[PDB]
Design a protein around this ligand. Structure first.
Ligand SMILES: [K+]
Ligand SMILES: [Mg+2]
Ligand SMILES: [Mg+2]
Ligand SMILES: [Mg+2]
Ligand SMILES: [Mg+2]
Ligand SMILES: [Mg+2]
Ligand SMILES: [Mg+2]
Ligand SMILES: [Mg+2]
Ligand SMILES: [Mg+2]
Ligand SMILES: [Mg+2]
Ligand SMILES: [Mg+2]
Ligand SMILES: [Mg+2]
Ligand SMILES: [Mg+2]
Ligand SMILES: [Mg+2]
Ligand SMILES: [Mg+2]
Ligand SMILES: [Mg+2]
Ligand SMILES: [Mg+2]
Ligand SMILES: [Mg+2]
Ligand SMILES: [Mg+2]
Ligand SMILES: [Mg+2]
Ligand SMILES: [Mg+2]
Ligand SMILES: [Mg+2]
Ligand SMILES: [Mg+2]
Ligand SMILES: [Mg+2]
Ligand SMILES: [Mg+2]
Lengths: 72, 86, 137, 97, 99, 122, 49
RNA sequence: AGAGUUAAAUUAUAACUAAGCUGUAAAAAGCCCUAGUUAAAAUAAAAUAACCCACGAAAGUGACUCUAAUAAUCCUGACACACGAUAGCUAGGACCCAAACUGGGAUUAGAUACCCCACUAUGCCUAGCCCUAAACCCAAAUAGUUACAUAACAAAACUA
């Protein structure tokens, strides 16, 4: 079982630069606090494959799909 | 029960006649379908009959509105035939 | 002569006074026209009853009271009792659908009473109590 | 060698498809006036497609928007709000004859 | 010898384009008491009624002006494998030809 | 905005109306909500009499609050407003601006359908 | 782009510091969403009254 | 599948007036603790939109709001696993209204039927079971073709 930390930016609003210079207000509005269960699954799936899979960019591989089904 | 009174389903007579005003009220209900609705709520129809009634009402509305179009489309072909005894 | 079907809204101020009183001040004539009986009651603007009449009280009995003529006579009788108490105009509210709707409306007209507004308040459930089963006559 | 033969091109005379009244417009449950124009003033019923004339997308949205206002307390249920009785007529139904 | 394809390109019918809302002149070839059978050069003959003004000068061979709406009236009804033609055309009168 | 609070308040004077909004917004902030703005729709006569807290109300004021809140705290906000007596009817809906107006092209005409029966001589 | 507009929108959010000011301002500036539609599809704003 | 919510009708109940009220092709029985109007919880059911044809594997679902959410990088497959309207059973709670059974009235040669009046199981909520339907679109799943060609009828014919 996994537990995504609450105060983390959602999947989309991570790689964009200049986040840590923003005030706590916007960081609160983008964290998992103001995101529904759907955004939580993305973070679970993103972390899970990066720990077990070898090549994360491959989605058609059987191992990648097994990880995806396990999250569901 | 909670709404204001004498606003809904209300008409006012003009020039002192009441038969004309009443017929206006009936056309209001018939167009909105309340008159037939009250008729069908006197007794209860099972959902089996309700769908069988909506499959006969819809079919009639298709045939009638299609035969109506053909009549209007062919209506112009009713003038006196110019080639009588040709 | 611009005439509007819709009633004068109480919130506004419409200069349309019958017999010196406003629209809401005019008494009410409730008509419950069922499939077997027709009951007519006239009430004041404060919902205080003035006179009551029905096909049963006018001598009609059993099946006879459900006919149109019985409702027509009830309208005449109710208007006469109402006119005795001094009412000229009345707003008639029709309740239910039955054979006595037309007769009762013109019954008040020929009984010495004048109507200005017609309202239909038939009980229309929006989904409500389940009605009785069908009749396999 | 013959250049007079027709070319396989799409029809250039395709007139643009008809737009519904509320096309590209955002319906809402807060503007009673927009929702009130599609309700019969005497009874309070909601007109169908054959009377309203709206498309298949803005007819369901109007229906859902109206019913949301019925319960949330923004418009009357059994009659049209008399304040919006003088708005321009968009429906194609005539009661007076 | 002119190829048939070249004939269609320069034909007046092709240059007309869509038949809706086109001002086309025609000639009357048959007269009834109230119906004027007008030939406008199309496949069929359109029928129009005599106007109340200058109605006495609408005679056989007279040229009039038309506004074509449908070149040939034809519609499809349910249960019909083939459309039922009317063998006529739809047009309206804008007056008589100004010679 | 993410959530919209369709708030209806009992008709009263300026001081208590401000106090009612002040504590209602305070309750929202306690649950972890960042309110964007407050919109006033004025006082209007209610469409129908609404029974709330053993009272019959015919006139009330309309107010609208939009905020970002976690999904699990919606029930607490609804439950809190139910116990309050100065609010006649609270309702929470997702903000209509969250969804985008889907692009439309036109009313595509549906041709009449053929080949619904056999071609035998009827 | 999405986070940039939230950066600007964060300035006007209601905080406990300006809870009174926003409430007082709201009670003095009524606004309505009502607008009608014509047959041709043009928007009619009742604010012209 | 959960949580919260109620517009129209109806009833307990109160006030006022009236002597009758319900019911049928026609009546009787029942009621008179009643009927009409005004004020009004709970329970139950979801007008118009729907002349739309969407979601689910099927049975099913169309009052409002929020939360969770609709397998497979996209073949076939049982006696195995999971599900399955309505009626019925076990335990608790609810009961407006409808209503098998039962009693009364009428009809009839008889009517333990059709028609009228009263009321119960039950239809409802929570937990468990039962696993049956004209569960029928009487047309099995996946890919396709419009070629060949009309038993009849129906919803045209066919290949892997
Ligand atoms: K409903
Ligand atoms: Mg109610
Ligand atoms: Mg449940
Ligand atoms: Mg007796
Ligand atoms: Mg009573
Ligand atoms: Mg009780
Ligand atoms: Mg369906
Ligand atoms: Mg499947
Ligand atoms: Mg699927
Ligand atoms: Mg399989
Ligand atoms: Mg079962
Ligand atoms: Mg059951
Ligand atoms: Mg059961
Ligand atoms: Mg047993
Ligand atoms: Mg039990
Ligand atoms: Mg019971
Ligand atoms: Mg009962
Ligand atoms: Mg018996
Ligand atoms: Mg079935
Ligand atoms: Mg079978
Ligand atoms: Mg099958
Ligand atoms: Mg199979
Ligand atoms: Mg499959
Ligand atoms: Mg197939
Ligand atoms: Mg044969």
């Amino acid at each position: 079982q996994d537990d995504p930390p609450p105060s983390m930016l959602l999947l989309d609003y991570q790689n964009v630069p200049g986040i840590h210079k923003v005030d706590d207000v916007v960081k609160r509005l983008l964290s998992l606090e103001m995101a529904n269960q759907k955004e939580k699954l993305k973070i679970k799936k993103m972390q899970l494959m990066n720990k077990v899979l070898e090549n994360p960019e491959d989605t058609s591989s059987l191992e990648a799909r097994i990880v995806a089904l396990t999250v569901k | 029960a909670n709404h204001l009174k004498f606003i809904a389903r209300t008409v006012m007579v003009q020039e002192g006649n009441v038969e004309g005003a009443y017929r206006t009220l009936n056309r209001i209900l018939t167009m909105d379908g309340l008159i037939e609705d009250i008729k069908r709520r006197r007794y209860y129809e099972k959902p089996c009959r309700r769908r069988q009634r909506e499959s006969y009402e819809t079919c009639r509305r298709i045939y009638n509105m299609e035969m109506a179009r053909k009549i209007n489309f062919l209506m112009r072909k009713n003038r006196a035939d110019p080639w009588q005894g040709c | 002569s611009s005439f509007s079907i819709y009633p004068p809204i109480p919130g506004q101020e419409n200069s349309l006074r019958w017999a010196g009183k406003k629209f809401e001040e005019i008494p009410i004539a409730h008509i419950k026209a069922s499939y077997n009986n027709t009951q007519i009651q006239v009430v004041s603007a404060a919902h205080q009853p003035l006179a009551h009449a029905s096909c049963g009280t006018e001598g009609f009995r059993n099946a006879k009271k459900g006919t149109g003529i019985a409702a027509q006579t009830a309208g005449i009788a109710a208007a006469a009792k109402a006119t005795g108490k001094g009412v000229t105009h009345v707003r008639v509210v029709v309740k239910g659908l039955g054979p006595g709707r037309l007769s009762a409306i013109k019954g008040l007209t020929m009984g010495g009473l004048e109507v200005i507004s017609i309202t239909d308040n038939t009980p229309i459930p929006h989904x409500g109590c389940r009605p009785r089963k069908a009749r396999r006559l | 060698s013959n250049e007079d033969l027709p070319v396989p091109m799409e029809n250039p005379y395709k007139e643009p498809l008809k737009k519904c009244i509320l096309c590209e417009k955002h319906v809402d449950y807060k503007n009673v006036q927009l929702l009130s124009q599609f309700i019969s003033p005497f009874t309070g019923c909601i007109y169908g497609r054959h009377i309203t004339g709206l498309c298949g997308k803005k007819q369901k949205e109007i229906t859902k928007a109206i019913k949301r206002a019925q319960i949330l307390g923004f418009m009357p249920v059994t009659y049209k709000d008399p304040a919006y009785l003088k708005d321009p007529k968009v429906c194609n139904i005539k009661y007076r004859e | 010898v002119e190829s048939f394809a070249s004939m269609l390109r320069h034909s007046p019918l092709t240059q007309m384009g869509p038949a809706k809302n086109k001002l086309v002149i025609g000639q009357i070839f048959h007269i009834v008491e109230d119906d004027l059978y007008i030939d406008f050069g199309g496949k069929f003959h359109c029928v129009c009624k005599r106007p109340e003004v200058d109605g006495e000068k609408y005679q056989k061979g007279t040229r009039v002006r038309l506004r074509l709406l449908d070149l040939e009236l034809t519609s499809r009804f349910l249960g019909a494998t083939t459309d039922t033609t009317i063998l006529e055309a739809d047009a309206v009168l804008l007056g008589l030809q100004e010679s | 905005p993410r959530y919209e609070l369709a708030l209806i308040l009992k008709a009263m004077q300026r001081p208590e109306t401000a106090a009612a909004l002040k504590r209602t917004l305070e309750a929202l902030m306690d649950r972890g909500a960042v309110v964007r703005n407050l919109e006033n729709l004025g006082e209007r006569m209610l469409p129908y009499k609404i029974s709330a807290h053993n009272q019959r109300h015919s006139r009330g004021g309309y107010f609208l609050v939009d905020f970002y809140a976690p999904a699990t705290t919606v029930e607490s906000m609804m439950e809190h407003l139910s116990r309050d007596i100065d609010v006649i009817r609270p309702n929470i809906v997702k903000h209509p601006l969250t969804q985008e107006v889907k692009e439309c092209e036109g009313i595509v005409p549906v041709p009449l359908e053929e080949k619904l029966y056999s071609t035998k001589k009827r | 782009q999405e986070v940039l507009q939230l950066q600007e929108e964060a300035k006007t959010f209601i905080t406990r510091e300006n809870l009174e000011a926003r409430v007082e301002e709201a009670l003095d500036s009524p606004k309505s969403y009502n607008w009608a539609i014509t047959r041709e599809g043009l928007v009619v704003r009742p604010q012209q009254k």
